[PDB]
């Protein structure tokens, strides 16, 4: 993705303050709750019987940190996302996950997640989604 410097600034400043232990499990968890078909993508994780059950499931939380991880990778490699994600379902579900994440960021940062800051994150999540859908 071509991120302008202010755009990069918007992303990095907020990203430094992210609770990397919780935000990933929230996003991934909200995905399983908001878009129930996604659960099938995860056979192992066991109980996903309810929203409360989804959000409190160790593998969710575990794998959430990796989603965040992958997001960080992409952020410091927006020059070449394809060869950073050399390693996964319809491209659309990556887009959905990217948007849930954006909602979680909005949730955790409130006012700080201004429209311009959101705009800059949408470019990153879009880039990552497309890279992961390759």
């Amino acid at each position: 993705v071509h991120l302008t410097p202010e755009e990069k600034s918007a992303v990095t400043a907020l990203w430094g303050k992210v609770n990397v232990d919780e935000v990933g499990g929230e996003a991934l968890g909200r995905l399983l709750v908001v878009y129930p078909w996604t659960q099938r993508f995860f056979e192992s994780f066991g109980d996903l019987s309810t929203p409360d059950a989804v959000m409190g499931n160790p593998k969710v939380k575990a794998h959430g940190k990796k989603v965040l991880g992958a997001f960080s990778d992409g952020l410091a490699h927006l020059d070449n996302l394809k060869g950073t994600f050399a390693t996964h379902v319809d491209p659309e579900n990556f887009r959905l996950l990217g948007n849930v994440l954006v909602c979680v960021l909005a949730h955790h940062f409130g006012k700080e997640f201004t429209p311009p800051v959101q705009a800059a994150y949408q470019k990153v999540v879009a880039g990552v989604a497309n890279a992961l859908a390759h």
Binding site: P51, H107, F109, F113, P115, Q118
Partner: protein, 140 residues
């Protein structure tokens, strides 16, 4: 198909939003135009800069239409008839743009109601907006 819990969730969120609805509609629009620049071509004659009185006005209209849909949530096709003809037949809005605006409305609620925006409430609001979107794109 909105469950009674969804209806209860959506109504509760409308509750917490209160009289900020117009303002929140505005902000969602701003979020949309910046994050998804293609959407701006539907608004050539608008000043889309921050604080625009035209964006403020329009966001109030959008919030009012959503409120109307909630208020008649079992008869949305009828309530939203004139609006789906406008959007599909007259304005020819690409259906994809509805998911874009929906997501921005969700982002906006989340940014302002950290307590109310639980996973369950998020799920219900999403269905609600997708229901509204279905109506507004049914008359091509």
């Amino acid at each position: 198909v909105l469950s009674p819990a969804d209806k209860t969730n959506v109504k509760a969120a409308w509750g917490k939003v209160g009289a900020h609805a117009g303002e929140y509609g505005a902000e969602a629009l701003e979020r949309m135009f910046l994050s998804f620049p293609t959407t701006k071509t539907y608004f050539p004659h608008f000043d889309l800069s921050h604080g625009s009185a035209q964006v403020k006005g329009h966001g109030k209209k959008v919030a009012d239409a959503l409120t109307n849909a909630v208020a008649h949530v079992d008869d949305m096709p009828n309530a939203l008839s004139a609006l789906s003809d406008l959007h599909a037949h007259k304005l020819r809005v690409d259906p994809v743009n509805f998911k874009l605006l929906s997501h921005c409305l969700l982002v906006t609620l989340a940014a302002h109601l950290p307590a109310e925006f639980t996973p369950a409430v998020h799920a219900s609001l999403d269905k609600f907006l997708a229901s509204v979107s279905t109506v507004l794109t049914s008359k091509y």
